[PDB]
């Protein structure tokens with residue numbers, strides 16, 4: 001009887017600690033990605049001529065990789081509307097490519113080609129981030145809301161690891177104060193994004209912890225309560241505990257669930 | 263009764279430990295973002311040809327990112343200038359290196375650390391030799407010799423006279439060897455990225471928003487020297503409960519310094 005009580009208390013403690021650790025690391029990453037969005041705005045748009053380039057972005061992001069613990073890499077995609085495509089591709093000496101096959105993009109109203117990338121995600125360069133549905137939806141919500149947004153869990157490029165993408169908007173100085181959504185769209189310069197590689201880096205975070213073999217941990221995206229999506233853990237459908245997670249995007253909801261094996 | 267007294271201590275422990283965690287975490291976040299600024303100056307001012315950082319750019323970026331550094335009133339970048347170079351440096355900048363105590367032209371020194379970039383919140387630092395204050399000077403030396411973020415003892419900051427501490431990071435030239443000796447670090451020093459932890463104002467602001475703040479008295483001490491504890495935050499001597507206290511752990515990240523928090527009831 002006393003033993004059941006102690007067992008419950010240990011589960012709550014273990015689960016709550018893991019949830020705090022994960023929320024905190026996510027939070028630190030989001031904050032540092034916000035700083036990068038501000039850096040691109042200040043150095044690429046506010047300065048004339050631009051005082052940021054791929055070499056500099058690669059260096060800075062490499063040297064600050066420690067500031068973004070759950071992220072496999074960061075990249076900056078620029079907003080390009082179709083009338084500007086020819087000039088853009090001539091300036092960059094490359095063609096805007098599709099994410100799925102790396103083929104030259106068919107005509108679209110607009111694109112979000114990656115122009116700067118951390119070398120860890122170098123394969124993103126020139127890819128149109130609107131040619132992937134999760135990234136596209138993220139890009140639109142980022143620019144319309146003015147804030148960091150997260151995707152549902154999905155399998156990331158190259159590694160195929162299950163993760164979530166974080167996108168921040170970057171705006172031109174023409175953005176009015178207290179802007180409408182329409183004003184936000186018009187003033188959009190691009191999108192600073194990062195991949196939370198949950199499958200690998202959350203596993204590295206949690207798997208090293210004492211007691212890991214005694215409990216089963218899942219993280220769910222419960223944005224749609226009738227359709228919970230696994231973000232971390234196995235696909236399995238008594239004694240559990242739900243620990244709170246808040247990853248900072250009001251559009252999404254998450255939770256951690258822990259159980260004992262036996 | 264004896265039940266209520268046990269619970270009274272339990273609440274003090276919880277309140278004090280939570281406040282200590284908050285202080286430690288917020289300082290850690292600030293230190294990490296100062297580290298990123300040091301890397302920014304290295305990458306964008308030194309490595310990039312030409313430099314992308316002038317005073318206007320530094321002021322803008324630091325203002326827009328001030329939320330990243332919650333326990334800091336301002337940040338600035340001081341460049342290492344040896345005396346051989348002083349006249350050249352002053353001619354290029356069209357200003358003279360000044361002392362921090364009176365803003366007067368600096369006397370001849372072997373070297374200087376004049377502020378060349380500043381967040382507007384600490385704009386009065388521009389052109390001041392940060393080696394002309396003892397706390398800042400010792401911090402600069404330990405920063406460059408160790409390669410890590412360092413903290414001063416508590417002292418009254420320039421202009422505000424608020425009781426605080428200074429955080430200083432070294433910035434090195436690309437000539438810094440792998441696995442450098444201290445002598446190599448000194449030779450490769452470019453300058454120093456510093457930030458003012460205005461403990462008196464900003465820790466009061468942090469604590470005063472918390473529920474139960476009126477019930478508790480919070481002090482923070484620098485206990486680097488056991489026999490000479492130094493007040494970092496708090497009063498005396500205040501109307502405080504002498505019968506019960508709690509000590510909460512604090513670690514601000516510099517192994518050269520030690521700190522602790524003590525809470526008591528107002529009662």
Ligand SMILES: c1coc(CNc2ncnc3nc[nH]c23)c1
Pocket residue numbers: 074075076077121124129132135155156157165166167191192193194195
């Ligand atoms: C700009 C907008 O969104 C991004 C990051 N998206 C992203 N990064 C890394 N791997 C990915 N795989 C799919 N989408 C990915 C950069």
Ligand SMILES: c1coc(CNc2ncnc3nc[nH]c23)c1
Pocket residue numbers: 336337338339340384387392395398418419420428429430454455456457458
């Ligand atoms: C470079 C080296 O150290 C600094 C920060 N020092 C500092 N900042 C703001 N107020 C001060 N008052 C004394 N020292 C101060 C900048």
